């Protein structure tokens, strides 16, 4: 994918149950794997902001639940540094359901998204109310 200007620690590993913060009907999704991630022996798949993950809808509507979907993490509590040396951290982890291309399935995103995902996925940027 296109590079971001910031360095993002891959804070979430497989099995992490992340709040889904769009209006698709998925409340909590669990990371199964991370797209474009080859690991090493014994290392769990790791995802930070801007990464696309295959997820399983753990909570939400019955239609959404138990479905394997794609989601993009837009918030993470683990601190990451912007190019000018400032470290940024959110209060919680958040993701939004998307397709392969990065287009959100929902229409509004409650909460702030990281600017890095807003640039790597412009549609997530336009869909979000505020970009921090």
């Amino acid at each position: 994918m296109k590079g971001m200007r910031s360095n993002i620690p891959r804070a979430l590993n497989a099995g992490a149950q992340i709040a889904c913060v769009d209006n698709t009907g998925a409340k909590v999704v669990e990371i199964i794997s991370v797209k474009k991630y080859r690991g090493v022996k014994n290392r769990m798949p790791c995802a930070g902001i801007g990464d696309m993950c295959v997820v399983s809808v753990k909570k939400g509507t019955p239609e959404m639940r138990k479905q394997v979907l794609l989601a993009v993490v837009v918030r993470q509590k683990q601190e990451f540094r912007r190019p000018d040396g400032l470290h940024v951290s959110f209060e919680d982890n958040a993701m939004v359901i998307t397709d392969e291309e990065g287009i959100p399935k929902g229409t509004d995103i409650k909460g702030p998204v990281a600017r890095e995902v807003a640039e790597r996925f412009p549609k997530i940027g336009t869909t979000a109310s505020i970009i921090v």
């Binding site: 590079g3 971001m4 200007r5 090493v40 022996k41 014994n42 190019p83 000018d84 040396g85």
Partner: protein, 337 residues
Amino acid sequence: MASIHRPKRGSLAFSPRKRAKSHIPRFRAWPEATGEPKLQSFAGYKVGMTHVIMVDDTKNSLTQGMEISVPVTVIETPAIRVAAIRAYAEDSTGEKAIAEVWAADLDPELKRRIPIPAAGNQAEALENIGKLIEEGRVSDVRAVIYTLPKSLTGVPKKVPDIMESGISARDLGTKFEYSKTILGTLVSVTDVFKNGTLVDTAAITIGKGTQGPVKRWGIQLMKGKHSRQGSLRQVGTLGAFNPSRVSWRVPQMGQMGYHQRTEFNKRILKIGSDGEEVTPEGGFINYGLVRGDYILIKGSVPGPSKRLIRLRDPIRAKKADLGEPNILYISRESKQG
């Protein structure tokens, strides 16, 4: 058996991992001349790290044009003295030292390292080297230099460090003429390196003493129930049944750090003369304050503070003319905060 694969633990490219035989890094290769004559190496002393805010001038970079915070290593670079000219003869068995002329006047603290060469043969020694060059017995010339750490205060030593440096020139006669120009003089780091260029740094790394395989080679710990069965920071196996031996490639405890290492393509971000420009409030921790002229190297450099860092022009650099960096802010805040 169906096997899970893992890259080998650590690198065998730095074996045996023993203590460096000197406190000075020795350069095994010298790059090719690409201009006017000059020394190919310089030696300073590592002070510490700070960071600068500079405009990203790196071509094709995503953050180009905007302000970025760049960690830098400050290295004090007092003028070195060109102590001697050494001529080499190449044969089938490699280079051999054939001639040496020492400068007539040398620093008194040089006696702490060696008995001082007298002010004897310099004209006749130089004419001997000239004759050897004319008769084809000389393949190249090197300059013997030493540092003068007495002007520094964070480095406690007064005894100089002596090393050979290459001279970059298009021809051997040009090298000899330039070396005779610089013999016995004090060369500044601006006479070797220019701001914004890449250099290679060599130093003896931080010594950690005897370390186990977990820290020395990065082997895995014992996991789960195995973590508390009595071998937690130990290698799982020393070998197979056959061959009946422990391979040298099996990770084992031993000396860690205090090795010679060369880093490549470390950019000089500023050549300074006023040490107040970079010294933080309260001084550098355990060092003090920079007094003479210094150099800012982007990123990290091998070695702790007060180690001699040898700088040579890059041997495997890729990028072309980088430019002069636009340092907007040098952080002088307390490193002790």
